[PDB]
Design a protein around this ligand. Structure first.
Ligand SMILES: N[C@H](Cc1ccccc1)C(=O)N1CCC[C@H]1C(=O)NCc1ccccc1
Ligand code: NA
Ligand code: NA
Lengths: 28, 251, 10
């Protein structure tokens, strides 16, 4: 649905989890 | 999960545990894709070589969990199955081609801080993100080693591997409905899915819209975290039409 | 035999 993939305790609060940046950095 | 870490609270709110009713035990991972649909691997429900053939009433879905074995009162929700749908061309005889199944819940699950659906990829997100070297994230309550068991949900980030390296790592015939992921021996780092992680999601966070997408389903591996071997994942976007047809027809 | 018993209701 419209809100899929946005986690209440991270994206919805603009908080990052401890390893998502590892994913972003691989998207070269 | 081998060589992963404890998840953060709420890190994977689409994570689902498929739970056997008697004997009460973990059967597989799975994922929440709407308030009434759960995605998993077909082999979690149907695998005749191992005399596995589960029916709706054999199972429960536990959503919002963190701890593997505890009943997480006031956090997790437990749902019954209304119907199981396995891909009609799932190949259990040979190589687990099209290793995908859908489960419809009897009643909608209430979303919360711990329960929230993952997105499924459209063609453009798939084409952009399913590239060798790009990393996804695998989660599950399966074994910590090839043969303890984890106290809580485990997470590991792993790079997608080039299709020739996937193919050259195994004698099994690989199809376009699969991809493989994991580090190579010379990369230092390691990690893999293992027994019990079957059916759980491989997810990627889109840098275009900052949403999580489920690109893969944990399907098969020869051993766990062996050097020179890789985990194989059902290619969710390649099977999207079937997913859509099921949800369109059966709601 | 690992798991905490879940509520009977389920
Ligand atoms: N070891 C087999 C390999 C295989 C592959 C394709 C056809 C027949 C056998 C396997 O992974 N199996 C046999 C059927 C279930 C699946 C499994 O254990 N998957 C769980 C798993 C996923 C990723 C890494 C390790 C284990
Ligand atoms: Na080969
Ligand atoms: Na490996």
């Amino acid at each position: 649905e419209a809100d899929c993939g946005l986690r209440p305790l991270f994206e919805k609060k603009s908080l990052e989890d401890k390893t998502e940046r590892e994913l972003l950095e691989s998207y070269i | 999960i081998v060589e992963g870490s404890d998840a953060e609270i709420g890190m994977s709110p689409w994570q689902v545990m498929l739970f056997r009713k008697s004997p009460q035990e973990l059967l597989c991972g799975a994922s929440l894709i709407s308030d009434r649909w759960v995605l998993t691997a077909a082999h979690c429900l149907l695998y005749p070589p191992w005399d596995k053939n589960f029916t709706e009433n054999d199972l429960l879905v536990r959503i919002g969990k963190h701890s593997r074995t505890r009943y997480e009162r006031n956090i997790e929700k437990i749902s019954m199955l209304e119907k199981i749908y396995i891909h009609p061309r799932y190949n259990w005889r040979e190589n687990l081609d099209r290793d995908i199944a859908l489960m419809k819940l009897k009643k909608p699950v209430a979303f919360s801080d711990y329960i929230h659906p993952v997105c499924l990829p459209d063609r453009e997100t798939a084409a952009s993100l399913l590239q060798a070297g790009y990393k996804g994230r695998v989660t599950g309550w399966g074994n910590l080693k090839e043969t303890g068991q984890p106290s809580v949900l485990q997470v590991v980030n792993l790079p997608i591997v080039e299709r020739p390296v996937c193919k050259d790592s195994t004698r099994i015939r690989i199809t376009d409905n699969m991809f493989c992921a994991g580090y190579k021996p010379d990369e230092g780092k390691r990690g893999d899915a293992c027994e019990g992680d079957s059916g759980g999601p491989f997810v990627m966070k889109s840098p275009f819209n900052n949403r999580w997408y489920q690109m893969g389903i944990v399907s098969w591996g020869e051993g766990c975290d062996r050097d020179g071997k890789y985990g194989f994942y059902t290619h969710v976007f390649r099977l999207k039409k079937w997913i859509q047809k099921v949800i369109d027809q059966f709601g | 035999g690992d798991f905490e018993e879940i509520p009977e209701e389920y």
